[PDB]
């Protein structure tokens, strides 16, 4: 199927700073990926983002009643919907399950990678650090980065390249808004 | 900067495919099943704390369809350029033999929002237990999508997520097996 496709998108965005203390409403219109006209509550009128949207800005900006609907949206729409959702979104808190398992950088004889797997947490911001005998190991640390699972949880793997010796204790430490003190998981050779 | 709530809509010709959803910080809160005119909550717990009149979503789609005809003509019928997806296959948690788990197929950075996705086990399509999200919007106005496959990890099975998209020359197959 090679028939040409045509795509319209609209994104009505509500941006919140310090809860509902400062709110910015953005009404954005797109043709394929190209934003062509927008209403910004910082401006109070539509503005063409490309020449494609100049007829819409001119036309909509002539309609004072349309504009007053858009100018009220920070209150009637953004602040309202924040109130509806805030308890299970803004305040959603899911702590991570933390696993440490060994692995290999390449097919080798001995495990030379320690994987700290951090799973199922929300929200996204997290800090994961590796310790050897109580000193932080900053070298040879590599990660998947932050992964969205698409179901309101995140995961990340944080790997430490090391050759483990007997008598060493390795500690993965996880800090996250859902935790009141660092979560630690140890691994011994 | 703290948080962003987006009412995202799209309409696609000639497919006459529409979508209406709400996103919070990159996660879907709900979408409206256009055919059934029903609100579909991304997590069930959401539907016990809030409601949405799904019928109102259809009015937005109708305006979006009308705007699309206008913009299509204004553009001198300039069509979309296909952007093929990046595809990643991962599991929901560390893999343990015989311990139930979920394969996730993450399909990212593509447009238009039309894709065919198949899970394969040992090269054969599997349908039992699978689920998927709608097309999720990106800040660069491309799309992403998730497909899921609950499974029991064994040494005997290999998996693939197979993705077809008009920007791909051949189907994309992303492999997973027990290490």
């Amino acid at each position: 199927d090679t028939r040409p496709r045509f795509l319209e998108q609209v994104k009505h965005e509500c941006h919140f700073f310090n809860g509902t203390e400062r709110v910015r409403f953005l009404d954005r219109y797109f043709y394929h990926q190209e934003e062509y006209v927008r209403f910004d509550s910082d401006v109070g009128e539509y503005r063409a983002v490309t020449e494609l949207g100049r007829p819409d800005a001119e036309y909509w900006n002539s309609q004072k009643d349309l504009l007053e609907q858009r100018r009220a949206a920070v209150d009637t729409y953004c602040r309202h919907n924040y109130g509806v959702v805030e308890s299970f979104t803004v305040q959603r808190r899911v702590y991570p399950e933390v696993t440490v398992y060994p692995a290999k950088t390449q097919p080798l004889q001995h495990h030379n990678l320690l994987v700290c797997s951090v799973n199922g947490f929300y929200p996204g911001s997290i800090e994961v650090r590796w310790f050897r005998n109580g000193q932080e190991e900053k070298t040879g640390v590599v990660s998947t980065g932050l992964i969205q699972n698409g179901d309101w949880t995140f995961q990340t793997l944080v790997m430490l390249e090391t050759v483990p010796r007997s008598g060493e204790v390795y500690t993965c430490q996880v800090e996250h808004p859902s935790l009141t003190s660092p979560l630690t998981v140890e691994w011994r050779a | 900067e703290e948080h962003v709530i987006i009412q995202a809509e799209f309409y696609l010709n000639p497919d006459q495919s529409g979508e209406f959803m709400f996103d919070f910080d990159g996660d879907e809160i709900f979408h409206v099943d256009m055919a059934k005119k029903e609100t579909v909550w991304r997590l069930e717990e959401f539907g016990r704390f809030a409601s949405f009149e799904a019928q109102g979503a259809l009015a937005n789609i109708a305006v979006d369809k009308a705007n699309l005809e206008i913009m299509t003509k204004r553009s001198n019928y300039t069509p979309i350029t296909n952007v093929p997806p990046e595809v990643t296959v991962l599991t929901n948690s560390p893999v343990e033999l015989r311990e139930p788990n979920v394969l996730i197929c993450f399909i990212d950075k593509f447009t238009p929002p039309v894709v065919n996705v198949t899970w394969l086990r040992n090269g054969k399509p599997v349908t039992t237990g699978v689920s998927e999200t709608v097309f999720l919007p990106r800040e660069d106005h491309l799309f992403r999508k998730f497909h899921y496959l609950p499974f029991l990890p064994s040494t005997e099975d290999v998996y693939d997520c197979r993705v077809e998209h008009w920007g791909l020359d051949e189907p994309l197959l992303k492999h997973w097996e027990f290490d």
């Binding site: 819409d56 | 937005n60 206008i70």
Partner: peptide, 13 residues
């Protein structure tokens, strides 16, 4: 506890 949608603006023909 009721979600509010906002309408999309209609261009002119």
């Amino acid at each position: 506890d009721i979600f509010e949608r906002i309408a999309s603006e209609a261009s002119r023909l």
